[PDB]
Design a protein around this ligand. Structure first.
Ligand SMILES: COc1cc(CN[C@@H](CO)C(=O)O)nc(Nc2cccc(-c3ccccc3)c2C)n1
Lengths: 125, 126
């Protein structure tokens, strides 16, 4: 059936860097964008909502606005790729990509963020 | 748009009893049973996978085998109802109902499990 595949289940990124996380779905010939549904979330916090042919930024979290973008060019090739710029300590956790394209499946990705003492002290408050 | 509806966000059930948790999805005409996908989960642990008309328990956690079943009759009016037999202290947590039927949505449900001392002390060890 329809199964989403993740090439890498764990990402290790440095503080302030940019990370692009990848999950893949099977594409037959072209993209019926009127049926593609991509939901990117981490810890019950929406990052990006792809419904119809565009993004639904009505539920995107503020912490991920101006930092999160799904590579629309890669959706043709069946790669729902989410990019987060300036990864911070709070971007560590379990991410979930849910894709609906005829079928439906989801896969989880765990992100670990290394950081220097200064940035870590900031998270400790 | 397509929205999943939960009549109850919190369940309070007794140890050893039977519990049925309900999430609801809108059906206008009939079932595209080739397009209905129902995922019942608890804390990144699959409970039930309803794809193409039947259940695919191939990813079901061992803790739920022989106890979890999706009520196929309630699918008539958009009721994806999950029943757990022998609710245990380990069955407490955040459940997730994920449905794809002409769109996609999911909602979370929290289950609290009361239990007598004997079952709790036994669960507190091992
Ligand atoms: C939390 O909100 C939203 C919103 C949306 C879409 N946005 C609109 C659509 O109409 C809205 O429903 O609001 N999809 C999602 N999850 C999602 C996305 C894709 C597939 C699946 C899925 C379904 C069955 C099995 C496995 C995965 C799921 C759960 N979650």
């Amino acid at each position: 059936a329809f199964t989403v595949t993740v090439p890498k289940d764990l990402y290790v990124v440095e503080y302030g860097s940019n990370m692009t996380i990848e999950c893949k779905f099977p594409v037959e010939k072209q993209l019926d964008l009127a049926a593609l549904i991509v939901y990117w979330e981490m810890e019950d916090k929406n990052i990006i909502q792809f419904v119809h042919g565009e993004e639904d930024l009505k539920v995107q979290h503020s912490s991920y606005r101006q930092r999160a973008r799904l590579l629309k060019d890669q959706l043709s090739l069946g790669n729902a790729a989410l990019q987060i710029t300036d990864v911070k300590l709070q971007d560590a956790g379990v991410y979930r990509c849910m894709i609906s394209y005829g079928g439906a499946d989801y896969k989880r990705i765990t992100v670990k963020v290394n950081a220097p003492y200064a940035a870590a002290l900031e998270h400790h408050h």
